[PDB]
Amino acid sequence: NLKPVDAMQCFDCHTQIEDMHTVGKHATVNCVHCHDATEHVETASSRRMGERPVTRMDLEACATCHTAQFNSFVEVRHESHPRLEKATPTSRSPMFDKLIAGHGFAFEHAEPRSHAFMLVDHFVVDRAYGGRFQFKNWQKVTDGMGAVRGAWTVLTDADPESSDQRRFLSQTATAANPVCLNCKTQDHILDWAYMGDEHEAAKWSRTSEVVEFARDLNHPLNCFMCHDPHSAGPRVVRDGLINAVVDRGLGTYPHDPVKSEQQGMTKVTFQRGREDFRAIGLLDTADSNVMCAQCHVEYNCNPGYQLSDGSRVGMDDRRANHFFWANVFDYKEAAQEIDFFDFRHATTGAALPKLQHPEAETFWGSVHERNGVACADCHMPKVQLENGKVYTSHSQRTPRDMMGQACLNCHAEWTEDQALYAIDYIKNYTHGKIVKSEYWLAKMIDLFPVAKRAGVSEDVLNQARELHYDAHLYWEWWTAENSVGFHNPDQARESLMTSISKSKEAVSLLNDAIDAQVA
C-alpha cells in the first residue's frame, strides 16, 4: 500500500510546485501517487537533482481516483474502422497516390481510430519505421486497454540489436522522427527540452535516433496533457502550441484578440541547472479548443526544403517542430514566412506543402466557434444521468454516438435524424468538391509528362508548378482535415473552389503550350 511522503520537504526546493499544489484542487493529493523520490530527497541539493526521482506517467496513476474519466477514455469505438487506407475509392482521397506522389504518406495513410491506439498506430504504420515495429500478433489490434498499459506490451521490434531507421518490409518508409512523438505521448515530458532543442539535461531531442526514443515510450495521450497534475487546472504541454500562442504572441484565438485575452495561456517554465528546460501553458479556462489543438493542427514535424533555394531543412532546425497556427487562406503566407516546403511532386516537380489534420485552424471563425462552442461540446460532452454525479465523457469520438448529449443538447428544434441530415448535407457537398478538386489536380498532373515530351519550356512548367502549390494546398487541407467540411462549411467550399480554379488555370496553360509545340 502507498505511504505518503512529507510534501513540505519537497516544497523547500520546489517552490513553483508548492505554489501550484497548495492552491489547486490536488492540494490533498500526496506526491507518492506519482513520484518515488526517496533516494532523490537523500541526495538532492537546492540546485542539483542528485538521484533522479521516478515519475509515473501511466494513465492508471489518475484512474486511481478518476475511474469514470479513465474508463471513458480507454473505450474502443469499434465502429471507427481500423487500418482503413484513405487512398481508396471508398475513403477520403480516392486520387491521393497520384496527388501525393513524392511524399512518404504514399506508403500508407489510414483514417484515425480511437485515441487508445495513437502510439501503437504511430509505431506500426507502414510510413513510419520501415516496418520495424508490428503488433505481436493480429489479435492485438483490438487491445485498447493493452496499448494504454504500454505500447511494448502489444508490439514487437524486428531487430532489438540495431537502432537505425531502415526498411524491414519493401513498401515502407522511415518518416518517423522524434518530433512526431509529441503528439502521441508525453511520457518524455521530463526528458525533452522545449521545442526539442539540444540541451544538456535532455535525453531526447529533435536530432535523436527515433528508434531509440521509441523504445523509451509507452502510453498514449497522457491525462496530464490537458490537466496539470499539481494544480489539477487546465493546461497544455505541447511545445509547438505554446510557441505559437505565447512566444510568437499570436494568441489562443488569433482572429479574436478579445477572446484570446479572456481565454488565454500563461507560459510556465521549469529549469535544469538554472537554465530554462521545459514549459507548460496554463489556461485561463478549461478550453478544449486549445487543449485539442496540441495535436489536431497543421504542423511541421519533419525535415523539408526551403522555398527560396531548395536547400535542405533538417531536424536540427527549429522549423522541423513548428505549428503554423494559420487558417487555410493564411497558410501559404505562413510557409513562405519560414521559407519552407515539404516535398517535390514526383511527376510535376512542384515544391508542395504537406497538410495534416488542421481541425483547430479550420474551426476558427465558424458559426459554432463564434458562438463559443468548443471541441468538447461535440466530442467530449457531459454525461446525462437520471440519477448520478455528472462527469465529462472522455471518449473522444463522433457526436453521432451521443446526439442527445452533443447536438440535440443545443438544437432543441431538431430530432436526431434531422441533425444527422444536416451533418450529411455538409459532408456530402464537401466530399463532392474534394473529389472534383482531385479530378482537376490529376488532369493537370497528367499533362506534365506530355508537356515535357512536347518540349514545353521550363518557364511554362514553372508557372504551372506555382499553380500546383495553390491547387494542392486548397485541396489537401480538406482531405487532411477530419470533419469533411463540417467544422467550417463555408471555408471548405471557398477553398475547394479555389483549388479547382487553380488546377483549371494550369490545365489551360499546359494544354495551350503543348498545342503550340504541336502547331
Ligand X SMILES: O=S([O-])[O-]
> Residues 323 to 362: which contact Ca ion by CB under 5 A?
354, 356
Return the residues of window 343-382 that contact ligand X according to CB under 6 A: 356-357
Q: How far is CA 259 from CA 289, 294, 440, in A?
A: 12, 18, 39
Q: Among 394, 405, 398, which Cα is nearest to 226's?
A: 394
Can you read off the three cell numbers belonging to residue 95? 486520387
8 Å CB contact between 325 and 248: yes
295 is in an annotated binding site: yes
The count of chain residues that interact with Na ion, using the rule CB under 5 A, is 3
Q: Does 301 count as an annotated binding residue?
A: no
Question: Does the footprint of its own copies cover residue 386 (CB under 8 A)?
Answer: yes
Instruction: Report, in Å, the least distance between residue 184 CB and ligand HEC.
Output: 6
418 interacts with, out of ligand X, its own copies, ligand HEC, none, CB within 5 to 8 A per kind? its own copies
Residues 6+ apart with CB under 8 A from 5: 30, 31, 32, 37, 38, 41
Q: Cα 229 from chain centroid?
A: 22
Q: What is the nearest approach in angstroms of Ca ion to the Cβ of residue 80?
A: 4
How far is Cα 427 from Cα 96, in angstroms, rounded to an integer?
18
Distance CA 327, CA 254 (A): 10
Q: Which three cell numbers stand for residue 188?
A: 518524455
Question: Would you say 188 is a known binding-site residue?
Answer: no
| Residue 418 near its own copies by CB under 8 A | yes
DSSP-assigned beta bridge partners for residue 269: 279
* Range in contact with its own copies (rule: CB under 8 A) among 12-20, 239-247, 414-422, 478-486: 414-422
Q: Does 270 bind ligand X (CB under 6 A)?
A: yes
Instruction: Specify the residue, 42 or 417, whose C-beta has the smaller distance to its own copies.
Output: 417
The answer to whether 98 is annotated as binding is no
Contact 2, 33 (CB under 8 A): yes
**Residue 415 is a binding residue for its own copies (CB under 8 A):** yes
Strands of 292-382, DSSP E: 299-301, 304-305, 312-313, 321-323, 343-344, 351-352
Please state, in angstroms and rounded to a whole number, the distance separating the CA atoms of residues 315 and 329: 27
- Name the residue whose CB lies closest to ligand X: 16
Rank residues 107 and 448 by Cβ distance to ligand HEC and give the closer one. 107
Query: Which residues 12-31 are close enough to bind ligand X by CB under 6 A?
Result: 14-17
Strand-pair partners of 270: 278
Question: Do residues 57 and 187 lie in contact, with contact meaning Cβ atoms separated by under 8 Å?
Answer: yes
Please tell me whether residue 425 binds its own copies under the rule CB under 8 A. no
Quick check: 228 and 280 in contact, CB under 8 A?
yes
Site size toward its own copies, by CB under 8 A: 4
Is the CB of 299 or the CB of 486 nearer to ligand X?
299
Select from 10-18, 68-76, 251-259, 310-318 the region that touches ligand X (CB under 6 A): 10-18
C-alpha 88/C-alpha 76 separation (Å) is: 24
Neighbour count for residue 390 (Cβ, 10 Å): 9
Beta-carbon count within 10 A of 203 CB: 14
Please identify, among the stretches 139-147, 181-189, 227-235, 413-421, the one whose residues bind its own copies according to the rule CB under 8 A: 413-421
Using CB distances below 5 to 8 A depending on partner kind, what does residue 372 bind out of ligand HEC, its own copies, Na ion, none? Na ion
Is 80 or 306 the residue whose CB approaches Na ion more closely?
Answer: 80
The yes or no reply on residue 387 touching Na ion (CB under 5 A) is no
Nearer to Ca ion, 283 or 315 (CB): 315
Q: Does 112 bind Ca ion (CB under 5 A)?
A: yes
Binding site partner of 137, from Ca ion, Na ion, ligand HEC, none, Cβ cut-off 5-8 A by kind:
ligand HEC
Q: What residue has cell string 469505438? A: 77
Angle of helix 489-517 versus helix 458-480 axis, rounded to 10: 160
Residue type, 370: R
Q: Give residues 80-99 in contact with Na ion (rule: CB under 5 A).
A: 80
Nearer to Ca ion, 324 or 364 (CB): 324
SS3 474: helix
Taking the least distance from each CB to its own copies, the nearer of 171 and 418 is 418
Residues 191, 247: contact at Cβ < 8 Å?
no
25 assigned binding-site residue: no
* Contact predicate 143/175, CB 8 Å: no
Nearer to its own copies, 309 or 386 (CB): 386
Contact criterion met (CB below 8 Å) for 183 and 128: no
Give the annotated binding-site residues. Answer: 10, 13-14, 26, 31, 34-35, 40, 62, 65-66, 115, 180, 183-184, 223, 226-227, 230, 292, 295-296, 298-299, 354, 356, 368, 375, 378-379, 394, 407, 410-411, 487
Interface with Na ion (CB under 5 A): 80, 371-372
Interface with Ca ion (CB under 5 A): 80, 111-112, 354, 356
Interface with its own copies (CB under 8 A): 386, 415, 417-418
Give the annotated binding-site residues for Ca(2+). Answer: 298-299, 354, 356
